[PDB]
Amino acid sequence: VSVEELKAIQLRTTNEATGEKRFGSARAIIEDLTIYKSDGTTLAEKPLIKSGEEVTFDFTILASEEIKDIALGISMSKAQGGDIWGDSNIGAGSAITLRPGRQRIVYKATLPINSGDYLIHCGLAKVGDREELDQRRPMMKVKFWSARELGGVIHAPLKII
Amino acid sequence: EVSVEELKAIQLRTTNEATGEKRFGSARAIIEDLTIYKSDGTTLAEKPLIKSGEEVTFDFTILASEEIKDIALGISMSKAQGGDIWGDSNIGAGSAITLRPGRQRIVYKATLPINSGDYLIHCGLAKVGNGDREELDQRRPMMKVKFWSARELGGVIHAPLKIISN
Ligand SMILES: [Cl-]
DSSP: OOHHHHHHHHHHSOOTTTTOEEESOOSEEEEEEEEEOTTSOBTTTSOEEETTOEEEEEEEEEESSOEEEEEEEEEEEOSSSSEEEEEEHHHHTOOEEEOSEEEEEEEEEEOOBOSEEEEEEEEEEEOOOOEEEEEEEEEEEEEEEOSSOOEESBOOOOEEO | OOOHHHHHHHHHHTOOGGGTOEEESOOSEEEEEEEEEETTTEEOOSSOEEETTOEEEEEEEEEESSOBOSEEEEEEEEOSSSSEEEEEETTTTTOOOOBOSEEEEEEEEEEOOBOSEEEEEEEEEEEOOSSSOEEEEEEEEEEEEEEEOSSOOEESBOOOOEEOOO
16 A cells, blocks of 8 residues: 555545544554443444443554554543543553554553543654654544542542541 | 631631642631541651552541531642642532531542642532531642652553553
8 A cells, every 4th residue: 555545545534523633644544443341342332431441442553664663642632621641652662563554553541531521532653753644633532431420530439438 | 615716717827828728718617637648557748649549548637616517528639730630529429427516537538540740639628508508618729749650641540551462
């Protein structure tokens, strides 16, 4: 596959439901992200996440050629304001080299996030001068739900002694 | 026993200027003190240093001039700027509290997945209803707290990735 084709995909499959602002050289792209809850259902099948549960991020990354030493980042924010959560393979100490074509990257995180509506952001880059390959802001929406309501975004219910 | 005028005087006297505390309320009862244990029993500093994910104990000393029923004792955290990133109370926890005259001790615990950074602690005492809500002692912010993490993450949610791909 070629960069021009990827540039076309990048511009076409932009998510307007979230008003996705997408940019990058698109030498490789975040082709798709499927999100699993701990019961094995996808967000598509069931669009909620319970506060504190194990979430799995199933990426498909599509590259026109081999690219070494890339960073694949994921983050979440409220409808407004900066990210409330974010991390990447670089932080986690796992080096990634993209091979030509379609390939699978899987992340996990246990997210103690309070009830509410959030936005998921994803970024692909080569970490020489840094190269932004494919930034997807926001890539999709997600709603969290809890047994009861807390202040803020941290899910940490009090225990009365 | 203890009068409201005395509680008013303690309220003023022990306002925390170091945190620029804004403090108000009728002071029929006050949050006389909050002390924070890392739950294994030690007392943390004036500025507690807590690891992301640790269980933390909040030990309130409450002073009441008379009996007050239907009490809300809330606690929350913010960054130096912005609204609270975390907060809860006995009301949320479905635990009723009645204050008796004089001094008494109320204890909360929570396990706080909060990223490394400097934060501010707020706490508030109020009579819930039985008419109109009465603010007894609101303390914003009453002390500082520092979190540290094994490695730095974005935002305030402590939730490091596991990379399954290898
Ligand atoms: Cl999905």
